[PDB]
PDB file of C-alpha atoms in Angstrom:
ATOM      1  CA  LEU A   1     -15.664  -0.840  12.827  1.00 24.25           C
ATOM      2  CA  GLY A   2     -14.991  -0.629  16.559  1.00 23.92           C
ATOM      3  CA  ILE A   3     -18.534   0.263  17.576  1.00 24.34           C
ATOM      4  CA  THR A   4     -19.927  -2.569  15.442  1.00 24.01           C
ATOM      5  CA  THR A   5     -17.521  -5.054  17.040  1.00 22.86           C
ATOM      6  CA  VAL A   6     -18.589  -3.845  20.501  1.00 19.77           C
ATOM      7  CA  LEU A   7     -22.216  -4.270  19.434  1.00 17.01           C
ATOM      8  CA  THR A   8     -21.577  -7.830  18.243  1.00 14.74           C
ATOM      9  CA  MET A   9     -19.812  -8.780  21.478  1.00 15.28           C
ATOM     10  CA  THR A  10     -22.661  -7.438  23.614  1.00 17.66           C
ATOM     11  CA  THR A  11     -25.072  -9.295  21.322  1.00 19.41           C
ATOM     12  CA  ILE A  12     -23.373 -12.693  21.567  1.00 19.01           C
ATOM     13  CA  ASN A  13     -23.030 -12.504  25.360  1.00 17.24           C
ATOM     14  CA  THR A  14     -26.765 -13.136  25.787  1.00 19.24           C
ATOM     15  CA  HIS A  15     -27.148 -15.565  22.878  1.00 17.96           C
ATOM     16  CA  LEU A  16     -24.528 -17.757  24.576  1.00 22.08           C
ATOM     17  CA  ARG A  17     -25.240 -17.416  28.301  1.00 22.41           C
ATOM     18  CA  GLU A  18     -28.999 -17.930  27.841  1.00 24.30           C
ATOM     19  CA  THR A  19     -28.279 -21.688  27.768  1.00 25.89           C
ATOM     20  CA  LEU A  20     -26.900 -21.690  31.343  1.00 22.28           C
ATOM     21  CA  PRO A  21     -28.562 -21.195  34.739  1.00 20.15           C
ATOM     22  CA  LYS A  22     -28.439 -17.798  36.406  1.00 18.54           C
ATOM     23  CA  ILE A  23     -25.537 -18.678  38.724  1.00 18.93           C
ATOM     24  CA  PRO A  24     -23.700 -15.689  40.271  1.00 16.73           C
ATOM     25  CA  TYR A  25     -20.071 -16.769  39.767  1.00 17.98           C
ATOM     26  CA  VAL A  26     -18.023 -16.564  36.570  1.00 16.94           C
ATOM     27  CA  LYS A  27     -17.472 -19.500  34.216  1.00 18.99           C
ATOM     28  CA  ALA A  28     -14.546 -20.097  31.871  1.00 19.33           C
ATOM     29  CA  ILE A  29     -16.304 -18.432  28.955  1.00 19.95           C
ATOM     30  CA  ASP A  30     -17.206 -15.473  31.171  1.00 20.79           C
ATOM     31  CA  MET A  31     -13.506 -14.774  31.732  1.00 23.40           C
ATOM     32  CA  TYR A  32     -12.790 -15.364  28.042  1.00 22.84           C
ATOM     33  CA  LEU A  33     -15.661 -13.173  26.832  1.00 19.98           C
ATOM     34  CA  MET A  34     -14.767 -10.289  29.136  1.00 19.58           C
ATOM     35  CA  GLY A  35     -11.131 -10.561  28.044  1.00 16.55           C
ATOM     36  CA  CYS A  36     -12.118 -10.388  24.389  1.00 20.38           C
ATOM     37  CA  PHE A  37     -14.468  -7.526  25.254  1.00 19.40           C
ATOM     38  CA  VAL A  38     -11.582  -5.657  26.883  1.00 20.30           C
ATOM     39  CA  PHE A  39      -9.502  -6.137  23.734  1.00 21.11           C
ATOM     40  CA  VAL A  40     -12.362  -4.913  21.520  1.00 23.85           C
ATOM     41  CA  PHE A  41     -13.087  -1.934  23.786  1.00 25.45           C
ATOM     42  CA  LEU A  42      -9.411  -0.953  23.758  1.00 23.33           C
ATOM     43  CA  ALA A  43      -9.369  -1.325  19.976  1.00 21.80           C
ATOM     44  CA  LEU A  44     -12.180   1.243  19.885  1.00 20.35           C
ATOM     45  CA  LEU A  45     -10.647   3.541  22.516  1.00 21.86           C
ATOM     46  CA  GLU A  46      -7.355   3.599  20.607  1.00 20.71           C
ATOM     47  CA  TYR A  47      -8.835   5.668  17.787  1.00 21.53           C
ATOM     48  CA  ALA A  48     -10.410   8.161  20.189  1.00 22.34           C
ATOM     49  CA  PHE A  49      -6.982   8.534  21.797  1.00 22.02           C
ATOM     50  CA  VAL A  50      -5.497   8.995  18.306  1.00 22.54           C
ATOM     51  CA  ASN A  51      -7.978  11.827  17.700  1.00 25.18           C
ATOM     52  CA  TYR A  52      -7.150  13.428  21.054  1.00 23.54           C
ATOM     53  CA  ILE A  53      -3.391  13.284  20.405  1.00 23.96           C
ATOM     54  CA  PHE A  54      -3.966  14.714  16.913  1.00 25.59           C
ATOM     55  CA  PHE A  55      -6.416  17.549  17.682  1.00 23.49           C
ATOM     56  CA  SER A  56      -4.397  19.092  20.515  1.00 24.30           C
TER      57      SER A  56
ATOM     58  CA  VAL B   1     -31.558 -24.234   0.591  1.00 23.42           C
ATOM     59  CA  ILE B   2     -33.777 -21.194   1.102  1.00 25.03           C
ATOM     60  CA  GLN B   3     -33.153 -20.900   4.852  1.00 25.40           C
ATOM     61  CA  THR B   4     -29.333 -21.127   4.979  1.00 25.86           C
ATOM     62  CA  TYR B   5     -27.607 -21.714   1.634  1.00 24.92           C
ATOM     63  CA  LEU B   6     -29.142 -18.856  -0.363  1.00 25.78           C
ATOM     64  CA  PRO B   7     -28.560 -16.387   2.509  1.00 29.85           C
ATOM     65  CA  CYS B   8     -24.913 -17.495   2.658  1.00 29.44           C
ATOM     66  CA  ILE B   9     -24.390 -17.294  -1.111  1.00 31.10           C
ATOM     67  CA  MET B  10     -26.108 -13.903  -1.271  1.00 29.49           C
ATOM     68  CA  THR B  11     -23.905 -12.632   1.565  1.00 29.32           C
ATOM     69  CA  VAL B  12     -20.745 -13.895  -0.152  1.00 32.11           C
ATOM     70  CA  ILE B  13     -21.738 -12.149  -3.384  1.00 31.94           C
ATOM     71  CA  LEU B  14     -22.798  -9.066  -1.397  1.00 34.82           C
ATOM     72  CA  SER B  15     -19.267  -8.773  -0.027  1.00 35.45           C
ATOM     73  CA  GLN B  16     -17.662  -8.901  -3.472  1.00 37.19           C
ATOM     74  CA  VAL B  17     -19.722  -6.054  -4.960  1.00 36.51           C
ATOM     75  CA  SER B  18     -17.664  -3.678  -2.808  1.00 36.29           C
ATOM     76  CA  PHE B  19     -14.711  -4.323  -5.147  1.00 31.77           C
ATOM     77  CA  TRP B  20     -16.399  -2.080  -7.750  1.00 28.04           C
ATOM     78  CA  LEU B  21     -16.411   0.930  -5.414  1.00 27.39           C
ATOM     79  CA  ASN B  22     -13.417   3.221  -5.808  1.00 27.24           C
ATOM     80  CA  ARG B  23     -10.530   2.568  -3.424  1.00 26.22           C
ATOM     81  CA  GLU B  24     -10.797   6.016  -1.811  1.00 27.03           C
ATOM     82  CA  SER B  25     -14.365   5.402  -0.539  1.00 26.64           C
ATOM     83  CA  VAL B  26     -13.103   4.065   2.780  1.00 25.87           C
ATOM     84  CA  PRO B  27     -16.326   4.220   4.872  1.00 29.58           C
ATOM     85  CA  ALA B  28     -18.428   2.457   2.232  1.00 26.77           C
ATOM     86  CA  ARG B  29     -15.989  -0.425   1.731  1.00 24.93           C
ATOM     87  CA  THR B  30     -15.573  -0.704   5.505  1.00 27.17           C
ATOM     88  CA  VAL B  31     -19.317  -0.951   6.122  1.00 26.11           C
ATOM     89  CA  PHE B  32     -19.771  -3.540   3.364  1.00 26.39           C
ATOM     90  CA  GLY B  33     -17.094  -5.737   4.895  1.00 24.03           C
ATOM     91  CA  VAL B  34     -18.243  -5.324   8.489  1.00 21.63           C
ATOM     92  CA  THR B  35     -21.946  -5.808   7.767  1.00 23.28           C
ATOM     93  CA  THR B  36     -21.357  -8.930   5.679  1.00 24.23           C
ATOM     94  CA  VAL B  37     -19.113 -10.397   8.394  1.00 24.50           C
ATOM     95  CA  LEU B  38     -21.902  -9.767  10.922  1.00 24.84           C
ATOM     96  CA  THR B  39     -24.395 -11.389   8.548  1.00 23.58           C
ATOM     97  CA  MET B  40     -22.212 -14.492   8.435  1.00 24.26           C
ATOM     98  CA  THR B  41     -21.763 -14.475  12.219  1.00 22.42           C
ATOM     99  CA  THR B  42     -25.520 -14.404  12.810  1.00 21.84           C
ATOM    100  CA  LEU B  43     -26.108 -17.053  10.130  1.00 21.66           C
ATOM    101  CA  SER B  44     -23.600 -19.297  11.910  1.00 19.74           C
ATOM    102  CA  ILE B  45     -25.265 -18.652  15.275  1.00 16.62           C
ATOM    103  CA  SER B  46     -28.784 -19.371  14.007  1.00 19.92           C
ATOM    104  CA  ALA B  47     -27.836 -22.535  12.103  1.00 23.36           C
ATOM    105  CA  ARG B  48     -26.866 -24.200  15.396  1.00 24.88           C
ATOM    106  CA  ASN B  49     -30.491 -24.074  16.612  1.00 26.52           C
ATOM    107  CA  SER B  50     -31.509 -26.753  14.072  1.00 23.94           C
ATOM    108  CA  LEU B  51     -29.590 -29.611  15.738  1.00 25.39           C
ATOM    109  CA  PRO B  52     -28.692 -31.040  19.140  1.00 25.32           C
ATOM    110  CA  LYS B  53     -25.280 -30.091  20.492  1.00 24.65           C
ATOM    111  CA  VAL B  54     -23.343 -32.420  18.181  1.00 23.86           C
ATOM    112  CA  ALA B  55     -19.625 -32.276  18.949  1.00 21.85           C
ATOM    113  CA  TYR B  56     -18.448 -32.411  15.325  1.00 21.51           C
ATOM    114  CA  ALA B  57     -18.862 -30.163  12.302  1.00 23.60           C
ATOM    115  CA  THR B  58     -21.557 -31.034   9.765  1.00 24.75           C
ATOM    116  CA  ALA B  59     -21.616 -30.383   6.025  1.00 24.78           C
ATOM    117  CA  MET B  60     -23.564 -27.153   6.477  1.00 27.90           C
ATOM    118  CA  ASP B  61     -20.880 -26.093   8.955  1.00 25.00           C
ATOM    119  CA  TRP B  62     -18.261 -26.627   6.231  1.00 24.27           C
ATOM    120  CA  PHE B  63     -20.284 -24.527   3.792  1.00 23.65           C
ATOM    121  CA  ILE B  64     -20.871 -21.750   6.327  1.00 26.81           C
ATOM    122  CA  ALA B  65     -17.183 -21.725   7.281  1.00 25.55           C
ATOM    123  CA  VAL B  66     -15.995 -21.500   3.671  1.00 26.83           C
ATOM    124  CA  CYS B  67     -18.447 -18.698   2.889  1.00 28.07           C
ATOM    125  CA  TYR B  68     -17.238 -16.939   6.034  1.00 25.92           C
ATOM    126  CA  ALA B  69     -13.670 -17.317   4.786  1.00 23.53           C
ATOM    127  CA  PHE B  70     -14.629 -15.652   1.502  1.00 22.29           C
ATOM    128  CA  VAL B  71     -16.342 -12.798   3.388  1.00 22.41           C
ATOM    129  CA  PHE B  72     -13.380 -12.222   5.697  1.00 23.06           C
ATOM    130  CA  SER B  73     -10.952 -12.387   2.764  1.00 24.01           C
ATOM    131  CA  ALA B  74     -13.068  -9.733   1.052  1.00 26.22           C
ATOM    132  CA  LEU B  75     -12.595  -7.526   4.112  1.00 21.99           C
ATOM    133  CA  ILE B  76      -8.860  -8.301   4.211  1.00 21.90           C
ATOM    134  CA  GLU B  77      -8.553  -7.293   0.550  1.00 22.65           C
ATOM    135  CA  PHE B  78      -9.849  -3.810   1.333  1.00 24.50           C
ATOM    136  CA  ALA B  79      -7.565  -3.623   4.355  1.00 22.85           C
ATOM    137  CA  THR B  80      -4.555  -4.475   2.173  1.00 20.95           C
ATOM    138  CA  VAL B  81      -5.420  -1.998  -0.583  1.00 19.45           C
ATOM    139  CA  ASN B  82      -6.082   0.764   1.955  1.00 18.26           C
ATOM    140  CA  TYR B  83      -2.698   0.057   3.551  1.00 15.24           C
ATOM    141  CA  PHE B  84      -0.725   0.060   0.299  1.00 16.19           C
ATOM    142  CA  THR B  85      -2.451   3.098  -1.240  1.00 15.84           C
ATOM    143  CA  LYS B  86      -0.958   5.134   1.624  1.00 13.25           C
ATOM    144  CA  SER B  87       2.279   3.261   2.322  1.00  8.70           C
ATOM    145  CA  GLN B  88       3.687   2.884  -1.227  1.00  8.26           C
ATOM    146  CA  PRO B  89       1.927   5.065  -3.829  1.00  9.37           C
ATOM    147  CA  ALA B  90      -0.731   3.423  -8.457  1.00  9.46           C
ATOM    148  CA  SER B  91      -0.312  -0.165  -9.636  1.00 10.79           C
ATOM    149  CA  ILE B  92      -1.935  -1.173  -6.325  1.00  8.62           C
ATOM    150  CA  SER B  93      -5.241  -0.938  -8.220  1.00  8.46           C
ATOM    151  CA  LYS B  94      -4.400  -4.258  -9.874  1.00  7.73           C
ATOM    152  CA  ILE B  95      -5.268  -5.800  -6.498  1.00  6.58           C
ATOM    153  CA  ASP B  96      -8.857  -4.661  -7.039  1.00  7.41           C
ATOM    154  CA  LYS B  97      -8.788  -5.676 -10.701  1.00 10.73           C
ATOM    155  CA  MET B  98      -7.623  -9.199  -9.798  1.00  9.05           C
ATOM    156  CA  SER B  99      -9.817  -9.844  -6.750  1.00  7.60           C
ATOM    157  CA  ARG B 100     -12.837  -8.528  -8.696  1.00  7.56           C
ATOM    158  CA  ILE B 101     -12.741 -11.723 -10.802  1.00  9.64           C
ATOM    159  CA  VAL B 102     -10.714 -14.164  -8.699  1.00  9.62           C
ATOM    160  CA  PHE B 103     -13.117 -14.200  -5.748  1.00  7.22           C
ATOM    161  CA  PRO B 104     -16.194 -15.009  -7.896  1.00  4.29           C
ATOM    162  CA  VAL B 105     -14.252 -17.710  -9.752  1.00  3.78           C
ATOM    163  CA  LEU B 106     -12.933 -19.361  -6.592  1.00  5.62           C
ATOM    164  CA  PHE B 107     -16.351 -19.276  -4.910  1.00  6.36           C
ATOM    165  CA  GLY B 108     -17.898 -20.798  -8.031  1.00  5.17           C
ATOM    166  CA  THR B 109     -15.368 -23.623  -8.104  1.00  5.74           C
ATOM    167  CA  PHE B 110     -15.960 -24.138  -4.380  1.00 11.34           C
ATOM    168  CA  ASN B 111     -19.654 -24.666  -5.106  1.00  9.67           C
ATOM    169  CA  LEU B 112     -18.932 -26.919  -8.100  1.00 11.39           C
ATOM    170  CA  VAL B 113     -16.858 -29.128  -5.779  1.00 12.35           C
ATOM    171  CA  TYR B 114     -19.115 -29.024  -2.704  1.00 11.73           C
ATOM    172  CA  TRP B 115     -22.422 -29.826  -4.400  1.00 10.08           C
ATOM    173  CA  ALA B 116     -20.752 -32.338  -6.713  1.00  9.15           C
ATOM    174  CA  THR B 117     -19.527 -33.989  -3.507  1.00  9.72           C
ATOM    175  CA  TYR B 118     -22.649 -34.194  -1.379  1.00 11.27           C
ATOM    176  CA  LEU B 119     -25.157 -35.006  -4.132  1.00 10.49           C
ATOM    177  CA  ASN B 120     -23.010 -38.105  -4.825  1.00 11.52           C
ATOM    178  CA  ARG B 121     -22.534 -39.097  -1.179  1.00 13.70           C
TER     179      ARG B 121
END
């Protein structure tokens, strides 16, 4: 579940930003997308941490 | 019809087949739900290429959204049964037995209302 959500986030990043010019600075949706990516990445990392706490 | 509506209907039905797998087959149910949700996400993304950037939802957006709701409810059903089979062990199997018919019936009535609407509009 987590790896597929990460995959989908990385997929949509390009399918959205391809409609904008290659400016260097962050837009609103850049901040939003990286925030959501952080949440998804932590949702994945949580289970790895659960395995490390368990198998130790 | 063949480009968007049949893919959406097939995805919605493809989510509900997972209700016939046994509750203990966690990875299979999980992958059904996830993959069908991704299918709906990509269908929603691609449908937007057919139009200019209109700032209001169209009819096909309504249909895609409702099918997405059915898909995500199919995932939520598995989440609920997987929670209760551990938390309070069982009669919890009646959740599967009910959804297994209710979701098809509700999706069918949704279609009977939607198409009855926009063929007479």
